[PDB]
């Protein structure tokens, strides 16, 4: 970090650079999913696929 109390610092507000952050995010239920729960062939070898 730099001493704030120095010279050279620009005050250029532009349309191009419109403030933004991440205020909130999408958390719709629908949107939560993707997707498949992970499972196993009973627990024995490659036979129990059923």
């Amino acid at each position: 970090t730099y001493n704030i109390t120095g010279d050279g610092n620009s005050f250029t507000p532009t349309s191009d650079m419109t403030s933004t952050a991440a205020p909130a995010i999408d958390l719709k239920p629908g949107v939560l999913n993707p997707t498949g729960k992970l499972w196993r062939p009973v627990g024995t070898s490659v036979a129990t696929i059923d």
Partner: protein, 412 residues
């Protein structure tokens, strides 16, 4: 004989992501060796405590014991797997498990089954059970595994004294072996038991079992020159430094009091020192052979057992044979033995008892420091060629004197 559910227990890892060895160590093993059969291992062990048990890879005999088990433990999960796995180093030289093979070329499909801490049932795997004959020698090996692995201590050794019907044939033969240390008898025994797909012929079986008692009885104090099993005891040769080698000795003093009928114990050693005690280890290897023949009372109940080795199949229980294990610290026992000896007036404590307790104190110290110093490496590197264990484990406790007293009453 074919004890169907021949379920065997692979070792846990000491809070490790991986089974107990690193890749290099396992390479060493598999590769520098070949056969999955204990010949190689026994070769090392046999050399009547002369050669130092230390090496870069293998700190003790017991060390090797442990990496032998872990080796087993890991590489079985391959072929004993549900639909057959095998790669990364080991792709089995034939389905019949002939030899430790470095991955056959055009053979990737059988994965390296990443298991955790898991018992397996040998007979539930169709390949395994087909080959019941060839299964037999390895089951022996298996037991050895299981019966160290069950716990976090020195080996769970089983004892048996069938009293009364004692074969005259056994007597006769056994006498001829007088002069030799337990070690070599054991070796022959294991070799035989493997070499022939195991027999119901109790001969062999009885013999080992009697032997085990006589040794144990000797080691305790109960058995000695003047109190014998008919003549039988084991003589602790060289009364100076702790190497006091138990040879089978036949001297006629008294015939000790025939117990009530069938006396059974199991011992474990709580103290890491077991490692350098070929005696202790050799009984445990004896009791394994016994197992192959016989359906021993469902294994040392979970009361003295780490959580990972609770609730195992048909092994640990609660209301069976031998609920508690008989537990000792080796250096206190020697003291115990001298006690009895003195109580009997066999000998003056004066010089005899003092001296050897002095030497075993020394031997403890040496051992303790070496085992700790060696453990330091694995207790910092990803590699483990050794028993895992804290300094507080060395403690003079662990039911040491009770064991001794039980062993004794057994002899009544």
């Amino acid at each position: 004989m074919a004890q169907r559910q021949f379920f065997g227990l692979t070792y846990n890892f000491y809070g490790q992501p991986a089974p107990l060895f690193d890749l290099n160590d396992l390479q060493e093993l598999a590769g520098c060796y070949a056969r999955p059969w204990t010949s190689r291992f026994s070769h090392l062990a046999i050399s009547t405590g002369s050669l130092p048990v230390w090496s870069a890879r293998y700190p003790s005999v017991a060390s090797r014991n442990i990496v032998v088990n872990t080796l087993l433990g890991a590489h079985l999960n391959p072929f004993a797997g549900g639909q057959i796995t095998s790669h990364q180093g080991i792709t089995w030289r034939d389905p019949v498990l002939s030899s430790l093979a470095p991955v056959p070329a055009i053979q990737p499909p059988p994965v390296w089954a990443v298991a955790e801490n898991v018992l397996l049932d040998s007979n539930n795997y169709p390949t395994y059970v087909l080959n019941l004959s060839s299964m037999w020698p390895i089951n022996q090996d298996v037991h050895i595994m299981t019966m160290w692995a069950l716990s976090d201590q020195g080996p769970i050794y089983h004892l048996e004294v069938p009293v009364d019907p004692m074969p005259a044939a056994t007597t006769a033969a056994l006498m001829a072996y007088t002069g030799v240390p337990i070690a070599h008898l054991a070796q022959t025994a294991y070799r035989f038991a493997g070499q022939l797909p195991q027999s119901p012929d109790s001969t062999m079986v009885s013999t080992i079992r009697w032997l085990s008692a006589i040794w144990f009885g000797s080691l305790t104090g109960r058995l000695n020159r003047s109190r014998t099993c008919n003549g039988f005891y084991f003589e602790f040769a060289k009364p100076a430094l702790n190497p006091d080698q138990a040879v089978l000795k036949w001297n006629d003093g008294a015939r000790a009091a025939p117990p009530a009928a069938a006396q059974s114990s199991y011992i474990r050693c709580i103290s890491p020192h077991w490692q350098h005690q070929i005696v202790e280890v050799a009984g445990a290897l004896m009791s394994q052979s016994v197992t192959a023949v016989t359906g021993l009372p469902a294994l040392i109940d979970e009361a003295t057992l780490p959580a990972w080795s609770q609730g195992v199949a048909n092994l640990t229980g609660n209301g069976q044979g031998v609920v508690p294990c008989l537990d000792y610290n080796p250096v206190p026992m020697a003291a115990a033995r001298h006690l009895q000896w003195r109580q009997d007036g066999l000998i003056t404590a004066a010089q005899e008892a003092q001296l050897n307790n002095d030497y075993t104190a020394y031997a403890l110290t040496i051992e303790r420091h070496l085992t700790a110093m060696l453990v330091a490496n694995p207790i910092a590197a990803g590699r483990m060629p050794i028993q895992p264990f804290n300094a507080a484990d060395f403690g003079q406790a662990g039911q040491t004197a009770a064991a001794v007293a039980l062993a004794q009453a057994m002899f009544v």
